[PDB]
């Protein structure tokens, strides 16, 4: 709305590697996340196809399509409730203390639903899981929501 | 009607027909207020559903 945030246009100049002021359709998922929006990858996929837009063939972009797609994704930020994130992992391990065994969270984050690479899974556990093999998800989900 | 079957259903429906067992209640419906229903079900198998 501007509140006209012109820093979204300045961040589009940091993600366009050619400097022509266009951003390919394959970058739009990760740049919506870098502007403070977390649409799921199936949602980013649907919307695209919904609009008869094929992410399979070469794509370019213009700021005039990327701005309204970020504004259509911005209504879905009401789905980001931290009660359900901590209660999900609290149902994932027994006893009254928030600890996932290391390999349980790593294999679930790579193979269940939207596949996260094991390189990204190791980069998200690095520092929050110590050598006991127990990830405290009270501080883990706190630090994941700090970015 | 003449059986009593339809009359047993009647009397049922006055009472409280469907009766859910608590865990059977948690699992299937936690998702509705996910945070607050899950906590309830986990925190007290019964107190939860409550």
Swiss-Prot record, chain A:
Residues 7-38, 41-76, 80-115, 115-147 form the EF-hand domain. One of its GO terms (molecular function) is calcium ion binding. SUPFAM superfamilies: EF-hand. This is Myosin light chain 3, skeletal muscle isoform. SMART domains: EFh. It comes from the Eukaryota. Keywords: Motor protein, Muscle protein, Myosin, Repeat. PANTHER family: MYOSIN LIGHT CHAIN 1, 3, MYOSIN LIGHT CHAIN 1_3, SKELETAL MUSCLE ISOFORM. The keyword Cell inner membrane does not apply. Gene3D superfamilies: EF-hand (1.10.238.10). The N-terminus is blocked. Myosin is a hexamer of 2 heavy chains and 4 light chains. GO terms for cellular component: contractile muscle fiber; myosin II complex.
Swiss-Prot record, chain B:
Muscle myosin is a hexameric protein that consists of 2 heavy chain subunits (MHC), 2 alkali light chain subunits (MLC) and 2 regulatory light chain subunits (MLC-2). Disulfide bonds: none annotated. It is found in: Cytoplasm, Myofibril. It comes from Gallus gallus (Chicken). The chain holds residues 697 to 746 of 1939 of the full protein. Muscle contraction. Myosin is a protein that binds to F-actin and has ATPase activity that is activated by F-actin. The rodlike tail sequence is highly repetitive, showing cycles of a 28-residue repeat pattern composed of 4 heptapeptides, characteristic for alpha-helical coiled coils. Belongs to the TRAFAC class myosin-kinesin ATPase superfamily. Myosin family. This is Myosin heavy chain, skeletal muscle, adult.
């Amino acid at each position: 709305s501007k509140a006209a945030a012109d820093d979204f246009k300045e961040a589009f100049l940091l993600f366009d590697r050619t400097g022509d002021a266009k951003i390919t359709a394959s970058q739009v998922g990760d740049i919506a996340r870098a502007l403070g929006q977390n649409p799921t990858n199936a949602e980013i996929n649907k919307i695209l196809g919904n609009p008869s837009k094929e992410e399979m063939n070469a794509a370019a972009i213009t700021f005039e399509e990327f701005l309204p797609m970020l504004q259509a994704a911005a209504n879905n930020k009401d789905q980001g409730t931290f009660e359900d994130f901590v209660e999900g992992l609290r149902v994932f391990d027994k006893e009254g203390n928030g600890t996932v065994m290391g390999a349980e969270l790593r294999h679930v984050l790579a193979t269940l639903g939207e596949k996260m690479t094991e390189e990204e899974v190791e980069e998200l556990m690095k520092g929050q899981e110590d050598s006991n093999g127990c990830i405290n998800y009270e501080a883990f989900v706190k630090h994941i929501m700090s970015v | 009607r003449c059986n009593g079957v339809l009359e047993g259903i009647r009397i049922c429906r006055k009472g409280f027909p469907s009766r859910v067992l608590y865990a059977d209640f948690k699992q299937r419906y936690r998702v509705l207020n996910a945070s607050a229903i899950p906590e309830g079900q986990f925190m007290d198998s019964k107190k939860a559903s409550e």
